[PDB]
Design a binder for this molecule. Structure first.
Ligand SMILES: Nc1nc(O)c2[nH]nnc2n1
Ligand SMILES: [Zn+2]
Ligand SMILES: [Zn+2]
Lengths: 182, 188
């Protein structure tokens, strides 16, 4: 709580993720790093979800986010919202497709909820890469909410390419561990 | 570099600091539309929202669109109002045990992002002024909201009212389009 701002603090691992230079060229290298943030997040009292904004072609890491809903007292503090918002703050624009910016990609541990679906559309990212599916997320009692018919087509029609199931099995291993062992 | 930090302009800090009780829907929405006009004057978009105690009218928090000045595409009025209400009441869930029922009063029907945010927030009531068609007829974009989003909220025990002070909300959207241009116009 602050008089004069909405302020979501980041746990140490996530401050480090957002300030340590990191270039990950391969799609699986990007998603592997996002899954490292999942496990660090769970250890830091957060939900089993992480995402990062990368420059699409180089794989330069711009920003990372994790679920901070409960410790942050903020239902909007999904991984995707934090990653997109922190990337925008770093690049000084609400619009990651502004002229001069390199094309940006959101790499996410799970397919977005209806709120984060909207956030992706507003953000200016040109690519979304997901590991776990809505079905995998719903099957451990998280709720994607009423996502419109053909949410993938909705993103694709707006110039946002969608890839799903990348390291899904590894993402499912961490989700199942969260369900059992947490 | 260690936080998501969305700064609030002074008028919005003022709005979040002063105790205020507005019983009637029209009183609540009247105050939300004052914040629309103040926000336009502070380089923001023509959108504002506030969380109230549904049954007492006590204001809990207000938000405005700070997308462009705040360099944050998530900084929609609804996201700021719901999040600031959560920070103030110290919970992610505005329906947590012991909290009064909360109401989001918004200058326009929520985009698909904000629709999802309303579902997760714990508010039990949504009250809107401008319709989605009003906002999209004047060049804005609410994005692909699911079929019967109002039915979707009502089925989750979130009551929906729309069109409240729609005429004043439309007047602000139209006055904003007029002055929304690079050529200096001292009238603005
Ligand atoms: N569906 C879903 N649910 C949550 O609680 C989340 N947190 N971060 N991304 C998220 N996605
Ligand atoms: Zn989400
Ligand atoms: Zn919105």
């Amino acid at each position: 709580h602050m008089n004069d701002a909405l302020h979501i603090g980041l746990p140490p691992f996530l401050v480090q993720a957002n300030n340590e230079p990191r270039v990950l060229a391969a799609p699986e290298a990007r998603m592997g790093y996002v899954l490292e943030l999942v496990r660090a997040n769970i250890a830091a009292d957060g939900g089993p979800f992480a995402a990062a904004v990368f420059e699409r072609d180089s794989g330069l890491l711009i920003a990372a986010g994790t679920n901070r809903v409960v410790p942050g007292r903020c239902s909007a503090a999904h991984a995707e919202i934090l990653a997109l918002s922190l990337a925008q703050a770093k690049l000084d624009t609400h619009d990651l497709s502004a002229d001069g910016l390199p094309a940006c990609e959101l790499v996410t541990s799970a397919e977005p909820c209806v709120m984060c679906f909207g956030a992706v559309i507003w953000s200016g990212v040109r690519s979304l890469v997901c590991a776990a599916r809505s079905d995998d997320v719903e099957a451990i009692g998280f709720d994607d909410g009423p996502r419109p018919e053909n949410w993938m087509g909705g993103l694709e029609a707006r110039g946002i390419t969608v890839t799903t199931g990348l390291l899904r099995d590894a993402a499912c291993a961490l989700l199942r561990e969260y369900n059992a062992c947490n």
